[PDB]
Amino acid sequence: GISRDNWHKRRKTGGKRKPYHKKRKYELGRPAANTKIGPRRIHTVGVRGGNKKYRALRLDVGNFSWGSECCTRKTRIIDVVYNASNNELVRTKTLVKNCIVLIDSTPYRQWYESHYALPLGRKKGAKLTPEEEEILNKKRSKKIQKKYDERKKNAKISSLLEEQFQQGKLLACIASRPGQCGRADGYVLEGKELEFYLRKIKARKG
């Protein structure tokens, strides 16, 4: 088949080598996964020594984490924006490791609100009134400062981050090979990586 043998290619000195044997099975190749976006489609392959291996095609959801707040929530995956190796994977939306994606960012909002009793990126004060303010202000008096002052001096979500929630889409980086674990996990961009990739996206495309 396709193969990952060393012996088919020439040595330091630039001289050829003549073939030493037929292609063995332990030099086996197999074709790319090319995970797209859509409703789940996970296949499995049998690899050397039993050992199922889950190839992923058409993924949709990812277990992304928020390092500063130690949160992590199963989140929908919205799109791919920047690929650091080849660019025609963002034109065809293939989802591989160290890609850069937009996710939905809603469960992080819910956690932040319910934990710090504060509002994140909002538009007005009309929508917050009919519901969900019954959670921000409570019956409590004991507790409502006994713990919520421990949640004060700490709710300082960075400006670069705060500007994102106003659209509801967050930049994230994959940290798992979907084509070998079936899952597409990762983390959400913080600190200086954020500035880096903001610059890079604004620079190349558009």
């Binding site: 330091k12 390092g67 500063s68 650091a84 190796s85 160290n98 700490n154 300082k156 960075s158 913080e190 600190g191 200086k192 990586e193 880096f196 990739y197 890079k200």
Partner: protein
């Protein structure tokens, strides 16, 4: 030094995090980045430059992810044109036993030179150790530079 990202992807040391807490330092402060480094063993003192420096190399034996194990060798430098890696030479004497006489031979080796050592010159001696295959033809990382034989680097007021 502060600008080190030149590739199409962000360069950071793994096993290292950037917290986002306690914003009060005043008019300046910590660079906001600690350093990861480790020891090699066998009696090799990690260069202070590796600690204080600010660079990224997944293959540098003092900061990155490689283990030194097996043979230890040494050789004299003969070329440094490829980036982050150099070419060294080893001379030895084979023994033809029909005659009772030796014959001179040499062998070239590619090794990987972290940016920790910065002041190497053709002619320097270098002591290298064994790693996992880091490229097609590279199996050895530089562990310790030296110019300890004559025709030394600098004149005789050192």
């Amino acid at each position: 030094m502060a600008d080190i990202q030149t590739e199409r992807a962000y360069q950071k040391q793994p096993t290292i995090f950037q917290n986002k807490k306690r914003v009060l330092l005043g008019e300046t402060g910590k660079e906001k980045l600690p350093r990861y480094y480790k020891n090699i063993g066998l009696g090799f003192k990690t260069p202070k430059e590796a600690i204080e420096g600010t660079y990224i190399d997944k293959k540098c034996p003092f900061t990155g992810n490689v283990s030194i194990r097996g043979r230890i060798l040494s050789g004299v430098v003969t070329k440094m044109k490829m980036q982050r890696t150099i070419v060294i030479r080893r001379d030895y004497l084979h023994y033809i036993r029909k005659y009772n006489r030796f014959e001179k031979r040499h062998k070239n080796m590619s090794v990987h030179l972290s940016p920790c050592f910065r002041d190497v010159q053709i002619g320097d001696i270098v002591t290298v150790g064994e790693c996992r295959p880091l490229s097609k033809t590279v199996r050895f990382n530089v562990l310790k530079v030296t110019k300890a034989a004559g025709t030394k680097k600098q004149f005789q007021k050192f």
